[PDB]
Design a protein around this ligand. Structure first.
Ligand code: NA
Ligand code: NA
Lengths: 667, 667
């Protein structure tokens, strides 16, 4: 739908990129990438990389040996990570497109496909020549990680059988051929297993968009890499960390509310953890590890891990006990809101915490080991051989209740810091002579709709079938949440011509007992929907803002084949070219109820720095230096806070149509 | 066997020394030491001590009162320790031999014998005039701590009875008279009790040599005393600590392997500990404390102790979290391998950790309290009255599985530091133009053989019997492990005349599942056998090294009576005069199996600093400043490591003869 135009030169480059996301598990020896790949000599091309040191390091490490082709790559393990990072450096410091391309061809040919794709996807994102380029949605690149094993197996069965043996029989199982695609209907995990109440939320926690979303978040801004590239953004890194989780968690909490599930559970490393996770997914070697209910974190195997983790926390508790201290070669003062940077970087243990370009093995990650122990897997066999859990991958992390429980813990500690900050005062927040006299919102209505994604990358083909470009294409379809578009009409009385910023937040109305929600202690349950600017004339004004224009969300990724068609028309998708790392639009609202679950909308209008000139979106945010999530980035005091340029509207989220996703999947 | 010659002046002094290790529990009032002892006045002789402050402190403390004669001294308790240290200062700062001697005479006469012997043994070792002198093996001085109570009681019975009542009946019990010695055959603890699998290792963990060995290690270099005396060695103290345990533990792990017992168990102070220890030993007041299986460390009595211990560890975890920090008035950087000193001193909490000559009560020992809580004894009655456990003494410490579990924990934390160090590079380790083309090793064969030790010091005599120099002498005999001597023939191709160092390590082949062992993660399971130097000529060379010449081990101590005979022949034992603090030779190999348990030998040849001059052993090590355990003192990367001057030979440890020690002790 929303597109953008592109010259034949961009087209050739884009198709070259996408060729690496096409048949990922296998090698076409006839194909151009293979000829290039097989014999390409990095050493002879040394002067075609910006950074000799990087390439040397790569050749060293590579001649030493990388991970093998049959294993499962995860970034959370040292040696694999380092291999990946070196490969990435290689892609990144390539002189030009051509060399980068030749470098990929090599790596595709010579290396573990998981490692390669991790590296490449990030390089494409992070390279400056490649800004403007497009990467396929992660569920197409790694489809095996966006579906339960039931479906995956059905796919393999159908392929072994070279088609359906009894079409009518297959239809009972949600399998049918549609033109030259085989289509699998896919149920969420709780259609087959309801082990605890968390399964109530599967349509969210398993939603291929939510998971892809987290995968983008990491890809844009990996914990091991410095934010150097982004210049000024670097000094805000910590801020972005906290914001991302605090937002995600708020959105998650909304889902919880509408399923009658309340606040996110706390755990202790010295105690068993009540909430299990039974992953219904596997790998060519092993199944993902399961965590039974009341799994005891404190066993022989974890004793040392727990020590480390306990210390990592106690250390931050000590920071909170002083207000000003020296850590990691910086001098920190918790009265300073800019210290959020340090705090965010502390918890993520990222490159910017130290002054470095990449993290080092001895700089041990709290998140890595939290994930590792929460994951409940047995100890890895060797460095390349471990039992995967959902927290070994960004594609799968959102699937485990424990994920939210972990980041909840971290975020909470970060707000323990936020308490140091002076609450915004009356006269910091006032917009003199402007008043929001009314807010009116359209119908807020959620629903489910079937969605298909191309899952072909999961299918293995034959020597003979590959040269024949024989087609066995696979689509997986499942109900995914969506909502109807809606308008927010804001009526404001500006005394005077002024330029304003309008901000829109969604928040809960009551807690799960009907206690109405007070800002004083519920400010962090506010989810930001929109940020925009408006000319405000004297007298009466009215802004109309449509949920499609909301800046914080994106449209669904277009499939590769569709992107591929658009390229022949000098076209490319807009949203995928620029706006990929945002939350998908359909998920903005939690699942409402047939009778209208109560939330509230917080509209806030405040003075914009004129510019004296015309305005464009991206730099317009950077010109006003308000902290992310303003004015709800720190504790509020209700009475000191409320003001005429604020408005709170009680709203109701309805749901229409079929309420349970499995009803779509009925034979 | 290996002896050395000595003038009549040394002889008189040596016999004077040994007279204090002769009848230790009783006083001969007719004897010369007593006459001297009883009336000797320290105050009047004040000007015969180097250090007035020391002697004053002694007289103060002594007039206050020392520990009583009937109790059991341990160095791990404050007040007793301080008394000991003061006594030691007195012995140490004596002007000359004569005064030192007069000082001992006094202390023997006036003080607790345990305290006295602890003090004296160390003073003899540490005094410069006394270098060259010889101390009896600890199992002769403290025989009660090198045998189970069954045997001790048999000794007392036979003495009360003034001999054997029915020789034939006694023979059933492993008791018989042999000339004028009464001989007791002694079984290891598991012949009478197999409470858990650790009992499989008793022939090692109870071996009187291994235990004596640890006792020497402490005596040479007590945690409470500065390494000032040893000059340059002081800056290496921490290094020696880690090395000693890391070596001992490796040797221990070997024993584990050949008994099918695997890796050393981890514990938690907040959890019960699975491995019990049932000491079969006692004291004139009480039995040693027992730790049942699944003994809970976390009870009211230990709550505070655990806090302290937990903190002591968390503190080091924090050091690891920074790489560079200030602690104990030093600035530490963990990228610097010399920081090992600080690290070793941190864990031992020794005098050199602070800048001091002796430790102070307020400088609370991690090892002391770890020992105390692991020991499972109830809380001491008063300062001189406690229930002993095997970890209250260096003579007994090796007997408890918990000992290895403790030092394992510590060592592991220290290798967590070792990860900071940059792995030796290809060109640090290469020996250009030299190549080990072959290694061939003789038959590696272990066996048991009966060993006797004079245990007479455990026998109480009569007023009448003492003046009559009536003889009731006691020998304890038990099978102890040994092995056949063997040659390592190393074939090397030196391009050129060079001087080299050869090093020999013993290491495991597989883990307990048959996974072959990779240096990357098994470097710390390498046990160093030999360090020597060789002229290497151009063309083909071959070094032949015999296990007797291996520098790291020693021959068995000669008994006092035998030493006593040698003195009448202007002779003294060589090994006991210089080489006492080394591991006994017989234990170098773990117990093999009748069919050949697999290990491997690592030979490594590297360039020696010419000297331009002739070479002697002790300073030849100090001229090349390679860290202890080079090249295996830090993590290795297999591929970066291997080199032509290295060689790895698969080897097999056979065992011959009777496999179980109890079969020697059969009536
Ligand atoms: Na939590
Ligand atoms: Na341990």
């Amino acid at each position: 739908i929303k597109t953008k135009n592109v010259d034949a030169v961009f087209v050739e480059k884009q198709k070259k990129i996408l060729s690496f996301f096409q048949d990922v598990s296998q090698l076409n020896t006839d194909d151009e990438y293979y000829k290039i790949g097989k014999d390409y000599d990095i050493e002879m091309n040394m002067d075609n990389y910006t950074n000799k040191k990087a390439v040397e390091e790569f050749l060293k490490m590579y001649r030493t040996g990388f991970m093998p082709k049959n294993l499962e790559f995860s970034v959370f393990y040292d040696k694999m990570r380092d291999e990946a990072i070196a490969l990435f450096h290689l892609f990144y410091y390539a002189k030009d497109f051509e060399t980068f391309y030749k470098t990929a061809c090599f790596a595709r040919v010579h290396l573990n496909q998981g490692q390669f794709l991790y590296a490449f996807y990030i390089a494409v994102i992070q390279r400056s020549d490649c800004h403007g380029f497009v990467v396929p949605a992660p569920y197409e690149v790694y489809p095996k990680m966006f579906m339960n094993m039931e479906v995956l197996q059905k796919i393999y069965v159908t392929k072994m059988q070279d088609g359906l043996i009894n079409p009518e029989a297959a239809a009972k199982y949600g399998i049918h051929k549609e033109n030259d695609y085989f289509v699998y209907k896919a149920n969420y995990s709780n259609a087959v297993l309801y082990n605890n109440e968390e399964q109530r939320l599967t349509y969210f926690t398993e939603d291929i968009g939510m998971n892809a979303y987290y995968y983008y978040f990491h890809s844009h801004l990996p914990f091991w890499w410095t934010s150097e590239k982004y210049g000024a953004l670097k000094e805000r890194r910590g801020e972005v960390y906290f914001y991302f989780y605090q937002q995600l968690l708020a959105r998650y909490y909304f889902e919880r509310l509408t399923n009658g599930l309340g606040k996110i559970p706390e755990f202790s490393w010295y105690s068993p953890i009540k909430t299990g996770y039974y992953p219904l997914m596997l790998t060519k070697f092993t199944p993902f590890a399961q965590r039974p209910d009341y799994y005891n974190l404190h066993t022989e195997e974890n004793y040392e891990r727990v020590r480390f983790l306990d210390t990592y926390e106690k250390t931050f508790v000590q920071f909170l006990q002083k207000d000003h201290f020296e850590a990691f070669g910086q001098k920190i003062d918790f009265h300073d809101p800019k210290a959020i940077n340090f705090v965010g970087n502390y918890w993520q243990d990222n490159a910017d915490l130290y002054g470095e370009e990449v993290t080092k093995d001895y700089q041990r990650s709290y998140e890595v080991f939290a994930r590792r122990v929460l994951g409940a897997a047995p100890m890895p066999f060797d460095k390349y051989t471990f039992m995967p859990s959902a927290m070994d991958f960004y594609q799968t992390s959102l699937r485990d209740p424990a994920f939210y429980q972990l980041y909840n813990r971290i975020v909470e500690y970060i707000v323990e810091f936020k308490q140091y900050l002076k609450p915004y005062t009356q006269d910091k927040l006032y917009f003199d002579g402007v008043k929001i006299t009314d807010v009116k919102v359209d119908k807020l209505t959620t629903f489910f709709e079937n969605f298909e994604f191309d899952a072909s990358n999961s299918v293995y083909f034959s020597k003979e079938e590959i040269k024949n470009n024989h087609v066995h294409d696979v689509k997986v379809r499942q109900p995914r949440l969506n909502h109807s578009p809606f308008n927010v009409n804001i009526e404001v009385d500006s005394n005077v011509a002024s330029d304003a910023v309008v901000k829109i937040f969604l928040a809960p109305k009551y807690d799960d007992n009907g206690i109405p929600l007070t800002l004083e202690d519920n400010w962090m349950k506010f989810f930001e929907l929109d940020w925009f600017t408006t000319k405000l004339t004297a007298g009466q004004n009215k802004i109309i803002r449509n949920s499609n224009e909301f800046v914080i969300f994106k449209e669904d990724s277009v499939p590769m084949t569709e992107i591929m068609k658009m390229l022949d028309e000098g076209k490319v998708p807009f949203d995928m070219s620029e706006e990929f790392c945002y939350m998908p639009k359909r998920l903005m609202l939690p699942r409402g109820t047939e009778g209208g679950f109560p939330f509230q909308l917080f509209v806030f209008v405040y003075p914009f720095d004129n510019k004296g000139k015309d305005l464009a979106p991206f730099e317009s945010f950077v010109l006003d230096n308000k902290p992310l999530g303003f004015p709800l980035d720190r504790p509020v005091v209700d009475a000191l806070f409320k003001v005429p340029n604020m408005y709170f509207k009680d709203i109701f989220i309805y749901h229409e149509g079929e309420r349970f996703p499995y009803k779509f999947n009925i034979p």
